[PDB]
Write a protein that binds this ligand. Structure first.
Ligand code: FAD
Length: 453
């Protein structure tokens, strides 16, 4: 167990009670460094380990598609943890008040949580730190190489972060030890009732079409830790050989479809890398898939961790801020409102088809995700308005939304973060441009539009 994966958030006197794992980002029992580190400290203190999850008040800012996907995986996780004699407690409310009350009520000895560079997680950490007196640690269980160890600053390009991450792969790319169960079972509400009351509160804002029928189709991705492993096994056996050649074709289902599991932490990215590395397939396809799940995935955490305003215009590179400022007063071809973007009522059938795939499946194709956001910048009144519209529609309808990948992905498309300067155009400036005619020369756009009417 590498001590470089764990950081100390607050020092204090350790109590004589159970070690608490404040689970948040990595919702899984297997291949979880944060849960394994909590079990090791629990063994050294001759005390059991407990898992605590907080059902926050911000769930109403999303939809039923994310609430059901997360809770149905937590129901399976509670059974998995119970088989390891590890009790799980699901609190409802503010993490600042619930975690502080749980630590005092249960005589917690040490508090451990997983790492997340998002602003809302740092908001919870500041509140919990102010209300506890026991040691507080955090463990990077989402990245193969810890986010604070891969780079000590913001990396402006993938060609500068790739050699840093690959040089540390021989040290941090390792097999996971088995989660040892608690020696004996130690001393809030049923998740089925929390799911029923939560869905009832989200029903008035459910995405529907004109026939009052729901738009979301929940049979595309089954939630859970067991279903995540089956999707990974199917990708290595059926789709990994053709990933390098068909990853940019939205008409082909050649992607791994692992992002909804990778977002909620239902499967470990280090586990996927370990199985892909030992798989015999196309070397160009393995290099392309490892460049997405390792470089681009962990450089998104590096972008959110070293840029406080990762969701703002100030985080864009200087060349892009100067270019977008010089074209602020350019007359846009079209100006669509948030409701017109949300309903897919633009003049572009390819953009509307990309929005319908987002509304119906909760997972838009990776290639169309770039064209979907770059047209928001082209058809908005300002780059700041384009950021708000792109972040709103991403976090609301994408099953993998509210993720550092989404913010770093939106920043790449609109602000050119981790990109270079291209030919200077009007409105968009030197930001990389994606045209409708360019997509037609890359894939069958007519089949993608007809699939999502
Ligand atoms: C406008 C826009 C919005 C996006 N929204 C999200 C989002 O809300 N949540 C999210 O997790 N990703 C987002 N992405 C990144 C990317 O599109 C998705 O990660 C990818 O499509 C997820 O589907 P997949 O797992 O089948 O892709 P795969 O090709 O099978 O890759 C597997 C994993 O590699 C990682 N990965 C792949 N592509 C990227 C990428 N471009 N950036 C970062 N990591 C990547 C992901 O972790 C992904 O799960 C967004 C990109 C853009 C341009």
């Amino acid at each position: 167990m590498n001590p470089k994966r764990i950081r100390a958030l607050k020092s204090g006197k350790q109590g004589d009670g159970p070690v608490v794992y404040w689970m948040s980002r990595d919702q899984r029992a297997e291949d979880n460094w944060a849960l394994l580190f909590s079990r090791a400290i629990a063994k050294e203190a001759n005390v059991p380990v407990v898992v605590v999850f907080c059902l926050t008040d911000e769930f109403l800012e999303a939809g039923i598609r994310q609430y059901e996907f997360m809770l149905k995986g937590l129901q399976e996780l509670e059974v998995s943890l119970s088989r390891k004699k590890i009790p799980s407690f699901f609190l409802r409310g503010d993490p600042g008040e619930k975690i502080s009350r749980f630590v005092k009520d249960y005589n917690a000895g040490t508090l451990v949580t997983d790492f997340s560079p998002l602003r809302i997680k740092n908001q919870w950490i500041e509140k919990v730190i102010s209300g506890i007196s026991i040691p507080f640690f955090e463990v990077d269980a989402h990245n193969v190489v810890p986010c604070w160890e891969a780079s000590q600053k913001h990396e402006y390009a993938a060609h500068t972060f790739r050699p840093k991450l690959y040089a540390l792969l021989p040290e941090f790319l390792e097999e996971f030890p088995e989660l040892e169960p608690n020696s004996v079972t130690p001393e809030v509400e049923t998740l089925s009732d929390v799911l029923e009351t939560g869905v009832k509160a989200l029903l008035p804002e459910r995405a529907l079409l004109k026939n009052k029928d729901p738009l979301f189709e929940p049979w595309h991705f089954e939630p859970g830790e067991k279903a995540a492993k089956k999707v990974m096994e199917s990708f290595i056996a059926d789709r990994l050989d053709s990933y390098g050649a068909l990853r940019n074709d939205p008409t082909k289902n050649m992607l791994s479809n692992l992002s909804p599991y990778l977002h909620f932490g239902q499967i470990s990215s280090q586990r996927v890398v370990l199985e892909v590395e030992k798989a015999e397939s196309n070397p160009g396809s393995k290099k392309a898939f490892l460049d997405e799940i390792l470089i681009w995935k962990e450089i998104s955490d590096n972008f959110c961790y070293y840029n406080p305003g990762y969701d703002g215009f100030e985080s864009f590179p200087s060349w892009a801020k100067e270019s977008l400022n010089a074209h602020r007063n350019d007359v846009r071809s079209h100006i669509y409102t948030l409701e017109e973007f949300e309903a897919g009522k633009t003049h572009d059938p390819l953009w509307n088809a990309s929005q319908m795939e987002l509304l119906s499946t909760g997972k838009m194709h990776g290639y169309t995700r770039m064209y979907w956001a770059k047209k928001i910048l082209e058809w908005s009144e300002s780059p700041e308005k384009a950021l708000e519209i792109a972040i709103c529609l991403n976090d609301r309808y994408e099953l993998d939304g509210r993720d550092p990948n989404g913010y770093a992905g939106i920043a790449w498309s609109i602000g050119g973060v981790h990109d270079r300067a291209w030919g200077e155009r009007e409105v968009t400036g030197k930001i990389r441009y994606m045209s409708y005619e360019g997509c037609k020369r890359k894939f069958d756009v007519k089949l993608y539009i007809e699939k999502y009417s």
